[PDB]
Amino acid sequence: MANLDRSNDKVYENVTGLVKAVIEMSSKIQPAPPEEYVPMVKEVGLALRTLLATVDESLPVLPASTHREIEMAQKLLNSDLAELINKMKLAQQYVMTSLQQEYKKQMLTAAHALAVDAKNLLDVIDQARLKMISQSRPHSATRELDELMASLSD
């Protein structure tokens, strides 16, 4: 047997951890070699795909109020994934040519907004849980994810 206080803490964790990388990687994104791209994109794909599930679990765990946001957050994750993996896989082949920093620039932009998203997740819903405390009684999507997963695996 085990309590259900494991994922509840992971949500507020990943939303932060994934962000930390978004910054660091964003610093060496330019010089980011083709050998460091494999793992780099791997991390992003994890927080992204995982976020879809994590967030879905945050819906019930948290008080209804940010359903709309969470709803659009799911679909967004899907598209974001492709766009992300794409830009990454691009620089991987556009490095031996010359257009390296190029794909890196446009990538940083999108990747930047994406990161903030995962953070705004708990940031938004937070207003719901808090609103409760300070008042009374203080207390084919998977297809793409799976497909892209293999594309990165082998």
PDB file of C-alpha atoms in Angstrom:
ATOM      1  CA  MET A   1       0.000   0.000   0.000  1.00  0.00           C
ATOM      2  CA  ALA A   2       1.050   3.605  -0.608  1.00  0.00           C
ATOM      3  CA  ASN A   3      -0.463   7.068  -0.170  1.00  0.00           C
ATOM      4  CA  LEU A   4      -1.411   9.252  -3.136  1.00  0.00           C
ATOM      5  CA  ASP A   5       0.876  12.087  -2.042  1.00  0.00           C
ATOM      6  CA  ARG A   6       3.577  11.163  -4.555  1.00  0.00           C
ATOM      7  CA  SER A   7       2.283  12.592  -7.837  1.00  0.00           C
ATOM      8  CA  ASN A   8       0.732  15.605  -6.108  1.00  0.00           C
ATOM      9  CA  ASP A   9       4.253  16.737  -5.215  1.00  0.00           C
ATOM     10  CA  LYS A  10       5.723  15.727  -8.575  1.00  0.00           C
ATOM     11  CA  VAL A  11       3.436  18.171 -10.381  1.00  0.00           C
ATOM     12  CA  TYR A  12       4.761  21.185  -8.480  1.00  0.00           C
ATOM     13  CA  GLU A  13       8.232  19.713  -8.981  1.00  0.00           C
ATOM     14  CA  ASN A  14       8.442  18.971 -12.707  1.00  0.00           C
ATOM     15  CA  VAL A  15       6.791  22.318 -13.445  1.00  0.00           C
ATOM     16  CA  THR A  16       9.901  23.820 -11.854  1.00  0.00           C
ATOM     17  CA  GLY A  17      12.632  21.347 -12.742  1.00  0.00           C
ATOM     18  CA  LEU A  18      11.812  21.330 -16.450  1.00  0.00           C
ATOM     19  CA  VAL A  19      12.074  25.123 -16.326  1.00  0.00           C
ATOM     20  CA  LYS A  20      15.563  25.049 -14.813  1.00  0.00           C
ATOM     21  CA  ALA A  21      16.805  23.100 -17.834  1.00  0.00           C
ATOM     22  CA  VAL A  22      15.009  25.398 -20.276  1.00  0.00           C
ATOM     23  CA  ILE A  23      17.230  28.197 -18.978  1.00  0.00           C
ATOM     24  CA  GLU A  24      20.561  26.375 -18.770  1.00  0.00           C
ATOM     25  CA  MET A  25      20.124  24.730 -22.172  1.00  0.00           C
ATOM     26  CA  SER A  26      19.013  28.112 -23.513  1.00  0.00           C
ATOM     27  CA  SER A  27      22.425  29.463 -22.513  1.00  0.00           C
ATOM     28  CA  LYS A  28      24.499  26.877 -24.379  1.00  0.00           C
ATOM     29  CA  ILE A  29      21.791  26.342 -26.994  1.00  0.00           C
ATOM     30  CA  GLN A  30      23.910  28.081 -29.631  1.00  0.00           C
ATOM     31  CA  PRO A  31      27.118  26.079 -29.042  1.00  0.00           C
ATOM     32  CA  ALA A  32      24.921  23.046 -28.384  1.00  0.00           C
ATOM     33  CA  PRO A  33      26.744  20.314 -30.350  1.00  0.00           C
ATOM     34  CA  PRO A  34      25.052  17.500 -32.315  1.00  0.00           C
ATOM     35  CA  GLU A  35      26.087  15.038 -29.607  1.00  0.00           C
ATOM     36  CA  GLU A  36      24.430  17.072 -26.853  1.00  0.00           C
ATOM     37  CA  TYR A  37      21.224  17.436 -28.867  1.00  0.00           C
ATOM     38  CA  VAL A  38      20.227  13.792 -28.432  1.00  0.00           C
ATOM     39  CA  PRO A  39      19.914  14.099 -24.631  1.00  0.00           C
ATOM     40  CA  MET A  40      18.783  17.729 -24.749  1.00  0.00           C
ATOM     41  CA  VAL A  41      15.667  16.951 -26.787  1.00  0.00           C
ATOM     42  CA  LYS A  42      15.173  13.790 -24.729  1.00  0.00           C
ATOM     43  CA  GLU A  43      14.684  15.819 -21.548  1.00  0.00           C
ATOM     44  CA  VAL A  44      12.200  18.189 -23.186  1.00  0.00           C
ATOM     45  CA  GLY A  45      10.199  15.296 -24.598  1.00  0.00           C
ATOM     46  CA  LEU A  46       9.938  13.872 -21.088  1.00  0.00           C
ATOM     47  CA  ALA A  47       8.585  16.948 -19.305  1.00  0.00           C
ATOM     48  CA  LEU A  48       6.332  17.657 -22.287  1.00  0.00           C
ATOM     49  CA  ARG A  49       4.767  14.213 -22.676  1.00  0.00           C
ATOM     50  CA  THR A  50       4.731  13.740 -18.901  1.00  0.00           C
ATOM     51  CA  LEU A  51       3.124  17.148 -18.384  1.00  0.00           C
ATOM     52  CA  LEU A  52       0.112  15.949 -20.375  1.00  0.00           C
ATOM     53  CA  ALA A  53      -0.479  13.153 -17.866  1.00  0.00           C
ATOM     54  CA  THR A  54       0.602  15.091 -14.778  1.00  0.00           C
ATOM     55  CA  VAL A  55      -1.696  18.020 -15.559  1.00  0.00           C
ATOM     56  CA  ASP A  56      -4.581  15.647 -16.271  1.00  0.00           C
ATOM     57  CA  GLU A  57      -4.123  14.355 -12.723  1.00  0.00           C
ATOM     58  CA  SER A  58      -3.982  17.891 -11.323  1.00  0.00           C
ATOM     59  CA  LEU A  59      -7.529  18.512 -12.551  1.00  0.00           C
ATOM     60  CA  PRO A  60      -9.161  16.374  -9.828  1.00  0.00           C
ATOM     61  CA  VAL A  61      -6.399  16.858  -7.258  1.00  0.00           C
ATOM     62  CA  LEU A  62      -7.147  20.584  -7.410  1.00  0.00           C
ATOM     63  CA  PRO A  63     -10.484  22.428  -7.070  1.00  0.00           C
ATOM     64  CA  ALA A  64     -12.401  23.055 -10.295  1.00  0.00           C
ATOM     65  CA  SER A  65     -11.618  26.552 -11.569  1.00  0.00           C
ATOM     66  CA  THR A  66      -8.860  26.281 -14.175  1.00  0.00           C
ATOM     67  CA  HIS A  67     -10.508  23.528 -16.217  1.00  0.00           C
ATOM     68  CA  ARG A  68     -10.480  25.700 -19.339  1.00  0.00           C
ATOM     69  CA  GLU A  69      -6.748  26.404 -19.125  1.00  0.00           C
ATOM     70  CA  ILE A  70      -5.892  22.775 -18.374  1.00  0.00           C
ATOM     71  CA  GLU A  71      -8.117  21.751 -21.284  1.00  0.00           C
ATOM     72  CA  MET A  72      -6.245  23.910 -23.796  1.00  0.00           C
ATOM     73  CA  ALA A  73      -2.985  22.955 -22.085  1.00  0.00           C
ATOM     74  CA  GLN A  74      -3.367  19.346 -23.224  1.00  0.00           C
ATOM     75  CA  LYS A  75      -3.883  20.008 -26.934  1.00  0.00           C
ATOM     76  CA  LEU A  76      -1.153  22.654 -26.808  1.00  0.00           C
ATOM     77  CA  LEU A  77       1.290  20.107 -25.388  1.00  0.00           C
ATOM     78  CA  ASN A  78       0.780  17.876 -28.427  1.00  0.00           C
ATOM     79  CA  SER A  79       1.457  20.537 -31.059  1.00  0.00           C
ATOM     80  CA  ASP A  80       4.242  22.029 -28.942  1.00  0.00           C
ATOM     81  CA  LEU A  81       5.926  18.619 -28.844  1.00  0.00           C
ATOM     82  CA  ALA A  82       6.151  18.268 -32.624  1.00  0.00           C
ATOM     83  CA  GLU A  83       7.286  21.872 -33.065  1.00  0.00           C
ATOM     84  CA  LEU A  84       9.887  21.319 -30.344  1.00  0.00           C
ATOM     85  CA  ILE A  85      11.257  17.966 -31.502  1.00  0.00           C
ATOM     86  CA  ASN A  86      11.237  19.371 -35.037  1.00  0.00           C
ATOM     87  CA  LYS A  87      13.346  22.455 -34.319  1.00  0.00           C
ATOM     88  CA  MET A  88      15.728  20.252 -32.331  1.00  0.00           C
ATOM     89  CA  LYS A  89      16.022  17.515 -34.957  1.00  0.00           C
ATOM     90  CA  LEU A  90      16.573  20.316 -37.471  1.00  0.00           C
ATOM     91  CA  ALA A  91      19.609  21.916 -35.831  1.00  0.00           C
ATOM     92  CA  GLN A  92      20.985  18.377 -35.602  1.00  0.00           C
ATOM     93  CA  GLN A  93      21.199  18.211 -39.396  1.00  0.00           C
ATOM     94  CA  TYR A  94      21.629  21.948 -39.954  1.00  0.00           C
ATOM     95  CA  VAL A  95      24.905  21.964 -38.023  1.00  0.00           C
ATOM     96  CA  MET A  96      27.218  20.387 -40.598  1.00  0.00           C
ATOM     97  CA  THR A  97      26.075  23.000 -43.117  1.00  0.00           C
ATOM     98  CA  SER A  98      26.209  26.440 -41.500  1.00  0.00           C
ATOM     99  CA  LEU A  99      22.679  27.382 -40.441  1.00  0.00           C
ATOM    100  CA  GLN A 100      23.221  26.333 -36.826  1.00  0.00           C
ATOM    101  CA  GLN A 101      22.477  29.392 -34.692  1.00  0.00           C
ATOM    102  CA  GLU A 102      19.566  30.020 -37.059  1.00  0.00           C
ATOM    103  CA  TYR A 103      17.319  27.138 -36.002  1.00  0.00           C
ATOM    104  CA  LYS A 104      18.630  27.768 -32.488  1.00  0.00           C
ATOM    105  CA  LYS A 105      17.292  31.329 -32.487  1.00  0.00           C
ATOM    106  CA  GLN A 106      13.733  30.579 -33.602  1.00  0.00           C
ATOM    107  CA  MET A 107      13.811  27.494 -31.378  1.00  0.00           C
ATOM    108  CA  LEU A 108      14.725  29.471 -28.259  1.00  0.00           C
ATOM    109  CA  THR A 109      11.702  31.701 -28.856  1.00  0.00           C
ATOM    110  CA  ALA A 110       9.140  28.893 -28.950  1.00  0.00           C
ATOM    111  CA  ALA A 111      10.950  26.786 -26.351  1.00  0.00           C
ATOM    112  CA  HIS A 112      10.897  29.859 -24.109  1.00  0.00           C
ATOM    113  CA  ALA A 113       7.117  30.263 -24.220  1.00  0.00           C
ATOM    114  CA  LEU A 114       6.634  26.520 -23.744  1.00  0.00           C
ATOM    115  CA  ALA A 115       8.641  26.501 -20.513  1.00  0.00           C
ATOM    116  CA  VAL A 116       6.542  29.304 -19.031  1.00  0.00           C
ATOM    117  CA  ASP A 117       3.466  27.224 -19.855  1.00  0.00           C
ATOM    118  CA  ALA A 118       4.440  24.282 -17.650  1.00  0.00           C
ATOM    119  CA  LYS A 119       5.075  26.835 -14.903  1.00  0.00           C
ATOM    120  CA  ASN A 120       1.799  28.713 -15.371  1.00  0.00           C
ATOM    121  CA  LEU A 121       0.126  25.329 -14.898  1.00  0.00           C
ATOM    122  CA  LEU A 122       0.301  25.301 -11.099  1.00  0.00           C
ATOM    123  CA  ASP A 123       0.582  29.093 -11.013  1.00  0.00           C
ATOM    124  CA  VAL A 124      -2.930  29.422 -12.439  1.00  0.00           C
ATOM    125  CA  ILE A 125      -4.667  26.531 -10.684  1.00  0.00           C
ATOM    126  CA  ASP A 126      -3.001  27.842  -7.527  1.00  0.00           C
ATOM    127  CA  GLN A 127      -5.537  30.677  -7.474  1.00  0.00           C
ATOM    128  CA  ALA A 128      -8.201  27.987  -7.112  1.00  0.00           C
ATOM    129  CA  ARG A 129      -6.749  26.068  -4.166  1.00  0.00           C
ATOM    130  CA  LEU A 130      -5.856  29.340  -2.444  1.00  0.00           C
ATOM    131  CA  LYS A 131      -9.317  30.801  -3.038  1.00  0.00           C
ATOM    132  CA  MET A 132     -10.651  27.823  -1.084  1.00  0.00           C
ATOM    133  CA  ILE A 133      -8.278  28.091   1.876  1.00  0.00           C
ATOM    134  CA  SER A 134      -8.822  31.818   2.405  1.00  0.00           C
ATOM    135  CA  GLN A 135     -12.588  31.464   2.796  1.00  0.00           C
ATOM    136  CA  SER A 136     -13.686  28.358   4.699  1.00  0.00           C
ATOM    137  CA  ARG A 137     -12.527  24.800   5.376  1.00  0.00           C
ATOM    138  CA  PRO A 138      -8.769  25.130   4.732  1.00  0.00           C
ATOM    139  CA  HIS A 139      -7.774  21.902   2.983  1.00  0.00           C
ATOM    140  CA  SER A 140      -4.978  10.402 -31.489  1.00  0.00           C
ATOM    141  CA  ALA A 141      -2.906  12.443 -29.038  1.00  0.00           C
ATOM    142  CA  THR A 142      -1.079   9.505 -27.460  1.00  0.00           C
ATOM    143  CA  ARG A 143      -0.318   8.381 -31.013  1.00  0.00           C
ATOM    144  CA  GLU A 144       1.999  11.309 -31.745  1.00  0.00           C
ATOM    145  CA  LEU A 145       3.618  11.054 -28.311  1.00  0.00           C
ATOM    146  CA  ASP A 146       4.316   7.349 -28.818  1.00  0.00           C
ATOM    147  CA  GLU A 147       5.386   7.790 -32.441  1.00  0.00           C
ATOM    148  CA  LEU A 148       7.829  10.622 -31.743  1.00  0.00           C
ATOM    149  CA  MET A 149       9.102   8.606 -28.779  1.00  0.00           C
ATOM    150  CA  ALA A 150      10.386   5.882 -31.101  1.00  0.00           C
ATOM    151  CA  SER A 151      11.844   8.457 -33.491  1.00  0.00           C
ATOM    152  CA  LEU A 152      14.052   9.657 -30.635  1.00  0.00           C
ATOM    153  CA  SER A 153      14.753   6.183 -29.254  1.00  0.00           C
ATOM    154  CA  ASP A 154      16.181   4.774 -32.484  1.00  0.00           C
TER     155      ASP A 154
END
